[PDB]
Symmetry: C3
Subunit: 411 residues, 3 copies
Amino acid sequence: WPSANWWQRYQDAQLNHLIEEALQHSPSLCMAMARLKGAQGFARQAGAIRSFDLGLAASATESKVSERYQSATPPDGWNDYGTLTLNFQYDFDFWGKNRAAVVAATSELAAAEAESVAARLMISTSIANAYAELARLYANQETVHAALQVRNKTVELLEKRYANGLETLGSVSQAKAVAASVEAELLGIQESIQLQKNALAALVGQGPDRAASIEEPHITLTSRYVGLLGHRADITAARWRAEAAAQQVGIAQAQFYPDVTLSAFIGYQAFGLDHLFDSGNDAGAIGPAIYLPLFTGGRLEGQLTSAEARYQEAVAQYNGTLVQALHEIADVVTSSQALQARINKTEQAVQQAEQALHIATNRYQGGLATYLDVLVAEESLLNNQRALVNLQSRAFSLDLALIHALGGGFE
Amino acid sequence: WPSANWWQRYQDAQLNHLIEEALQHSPSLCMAMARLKGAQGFARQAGAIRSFDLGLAASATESKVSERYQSATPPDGWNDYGTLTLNFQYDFDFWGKNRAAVVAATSELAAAEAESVAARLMISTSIANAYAELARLYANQETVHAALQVRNKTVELLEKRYANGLETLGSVSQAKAVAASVEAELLGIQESIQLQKNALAALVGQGPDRAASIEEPHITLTSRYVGLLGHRADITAARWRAEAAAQQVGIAQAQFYPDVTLSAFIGYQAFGLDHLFDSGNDAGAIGPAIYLPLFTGGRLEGQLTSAEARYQEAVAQYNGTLVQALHEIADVVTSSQALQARINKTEQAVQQAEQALHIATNRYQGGLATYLDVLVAEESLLNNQRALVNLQSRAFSLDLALIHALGGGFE
Amino acid sequence: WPSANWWQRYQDAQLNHLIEEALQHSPSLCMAMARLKGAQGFARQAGAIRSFDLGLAASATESKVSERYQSATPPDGWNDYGTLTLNFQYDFDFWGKNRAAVVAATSELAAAEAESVAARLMISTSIANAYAELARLYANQETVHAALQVRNKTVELLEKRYANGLETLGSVSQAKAVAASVEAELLGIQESIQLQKNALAALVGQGPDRAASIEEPHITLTSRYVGLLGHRADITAARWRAEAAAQQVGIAQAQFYPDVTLSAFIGYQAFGLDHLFDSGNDAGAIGPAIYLPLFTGGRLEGQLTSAEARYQEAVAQYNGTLVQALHEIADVVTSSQALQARINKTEQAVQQAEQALHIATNRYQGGLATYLDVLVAEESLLNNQRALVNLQSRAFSLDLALIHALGGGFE
Ligand SMILES: CCCCCCCCO[C@H]1O[C@H](CO)[C@@H](O)[C@H](O)[C@H]1O
Ligand SMILES: CCCCCCCCO[C@H]1O[C@H](CO)[C@@H](O)[C@H](O)[C@H]1O
Ligand SMILES: CCCCCCCCO[C@H]1O[C@H](CO)[C@@H](O)[C@H](O)[C@H]1O
Ligand SMILES: [Hg+2]
Ligand SMILES: [Hg+2]
Ligand SMILES: [Hg+2]
Ligand SMILES: [Hg+2]
Ligand SMILES: [Hg+2]
Ligand SMILES: [Hg+2]
């Protein structure tokens, strides 16, 4: 199914180059890279909760103690003190709170990894879809330009006839109005082409000088040959975020249980900075502490409610993502299955209108039909030719819609 | 005005069932439920600030004191100590800071309650609007299919005539081009119908198998029979959020004032863990503390500026919501008042075009008018019939727009 | 180039008044003001990190000390204690962490200042663009109303003719269908005009009574006469945010280095509240402390990774903004350069169609051409006249697009 570099299947080295440029260096690329690195840093920070912490502390203080407060034998006046210690703290994690925190953070990272794939897909498909439109525009340009050549040929026939007393000025004027209108349409298409090149340049992270070297597409379209949702990075990301939320419910539950910590220090403390290192002025301690909240008035309880709510939200978000992915795939299937008959009937309208015009103009070049018959046929032909070109372009768009709906093929 | 289950007024048990399904269980539903529960948990957490807090603390420590630091008679060497205490803390709230915090949180909850109603409205109206489009599509299907039957009948008349030397091949070819084009339009409509069923399935939280049982709508539209803004949950929510912001200004102001707290503990402390419970090794304390910031270099001041700014923003947000609600209601009124005359003139175009076609085809079936007169009339008729069906559908859309603009009728 | 009050160049005091109203008082205005004040408050709060902090603390405690814990000569029973102190804290900032924090906050403020300019631009251009559409609608109203007068004149000619046996009922019916359709189009345009007035009222922060005094625009369009990006407030804001992020990388780096603080207090502490102020019960201290983290298990490291990621994101965001601004300017140039030829060819279609109609109707008023020739010409004329009016309106839209792309002229 969809390749990793799936755009290569269209055999357009243009398209290949545009996507390749965007995926090597472009702002959308860099932002996606950055957002993944962010999640990596966040995961790293979270994992620290399961380590011990070590720090060095030192102080020098000039202090005067109250004479009648907490010491029966306080030193007199202002004296200097110093300390210099190595300090240690470790949280025991008896209920798994901190482990759950790390699982939540790593689940977020897994979601971030999936989102980086989704970002690659969003870049490549945004370019391919813009390219599809460029191709559609160039097709409409060819169709309208060819019609213009004909409209001009009709004016000049009708003018030669009018000159020889074989046609009216009304017909001539109408034909000139038709030709001017078709040319106006062509100019609009040509503007759109250039606008679309500008957009492609921006999509690949470049200024508008990149647009100057964009040429007519040459796309080769080949027919291809619930279980279909496993390459959807959005579903994967939402899965992992629902896992992270579940873990956060666990954290909130574990906050009701005793927290057991271990602290320690070792170093020197002295009355007199010049005595900091004297024999006997070492100090140290180690021991566990436990804290058990007994009544918080709603803090622990409310936090648990909020964590449950976030889990429920995340599950609903996952469900929504599944529903939306199935909708997207269902639509691609619907439209893909409808396309051939649409094209078929529109081809038939083109061909019958082309016959109509051929007969109308033969008859005109021989004085049996009016100019009006020609105008009506010309208009019907052009309208159907444009409809056809747009449906042919739709085949490419639908192939791209399938690739998007399947989530690409990054692997 | 708008009922609680307002969609029932259209007398389409289909529509009723789709909305009912979505409101019983669907991802959009669940996310809305979850976001309300979240606000409930947040409110619960906030209310804790006005309670006292109670906790149990215990520790066992092996400690060596410096010989010449803070004790004139320090114990020698490394000794074991233990503590086990019940701890209590209460913030007095003399300036109402904490009360304002709870008012802010409960105001947010009231806003969240209003937003849950808005979410129900967004679900039901999104479904009804998608349904409106489904109905419009089925109407265009009937209109275009009926026209197709006629186009085919015209081909086969013109072919019988051409066969008998009474018509040209040009006419025949044009008529076939017209019929193929009308059929191509029909196929496009039929695709849209299926796409719209897919969308309805997704809107009610279901996979695309739900779409398979969606049938043609049968909507019954009945005419109905600043003060009109009280069912707007968005205005209510913004109201309450502006209240919450106002309270937060109060909090920021109160941070300049003295904070008075009460702390207490009771328990046991001992040199020697085996002596933890000995007579005389109980320890306890109670008392108030007061802290008054005297200079913070911009922390309190900046926090007040930020809180005032948030209030101003929230008031502007409320004002914007009022303006937008009035715009929405004004537009519904504008369009509702315009609709009948639009329909009237478009009905007149339909009927006159239908007469034109009838005369053109009678005249054709008797050799007085061209095929061209028939083509022009057929085209004019179909264009006007589609315009009419779209305006008739607009009546339903406008009724739904009114319900949305009034904020529904949940009560 | 673009003035500060650039809309004045269109010489429409209407437009001037609408924009002026919105910029004096409107919800969008107020929200923008509020968001700037917020950033000001945040900057103020951040700057506090470089000041010292002063506070007053007092306590009164009833306390019972354990007999055999930490004092060899503990007081007996429950006794009262009091304290009353002035407390001082100052962070030294040897590595520039706190300075970087303030630079980051002031850079955010500079970005907020730029965004307030962008908000002014978004307000004025949203109004001008809505006004452009209002003008376009009024032009289409004039064009369609004038065509309607003609369509009605054609019905009544064809009816007088049909009455005298000189025309068919088919022609009459077709002409009536055409007129009804043109009137239906007019009614739709008139609805749109009123909807557009409603939108303008909302855009200037007013209820729908403001819409009642909005009249036909009278815009005067005058031709004007990478380096072009310096008035883009979005680029400026993104610049400053990338600076703020860079500083935050510095903060994260500086967190690995020793933190040196200074603390002090002075006051009174006493056993016996009635002795709080007794000679010798003063207490005080001053001194520096240093903390150096030695191992944090990923906290410092992960924070640095996250800060680098945010910098990278912000740089990419800046780059994206540059690319998007260049795209916007490139499009304005593309479309501006295309416009004249589009208008020219469309003017030619109008004029030739107008000749066609004139000849068709002269010939009709003299029995040489059919009604059909008239219908075809009338339709072609109207279609081209509307296309022209829309292209003329486009000239105004493009001028506004240029002003937007250049970022206005606030100075
Ligand atoms: C990473 C280094 C950790 C060890 C720090 C040990 C600090 C205290 O250590 C010391 O202090 C005394 C007072 O001078 C001496 O009497 C000692 O012999 C000595 O062990
Ligand atoms: C919720 C329980 C709160 C009460 C805890 C009281 C702890 C201290 O209580 C005690 O400690 C002493 C030392 O053993 C005794 O001499 C006592 O008679 C006793 O009151
Ligand atoms: C802003 C005011 C700062 C100064 C506070 C000084 C508090 C301690 O000050 C004092 O305490 C004693 C005990 O009564 C006396 O013996 C003193 O003479 C006196 O200096
Ligand atoms: Hg990057
Ligand atoms: Hg990069
Ligand atoms: Hg739920
Ligand atoms: Hg649910
Ligand atoms: Hg404001
Ligand atoms: Hg304001």
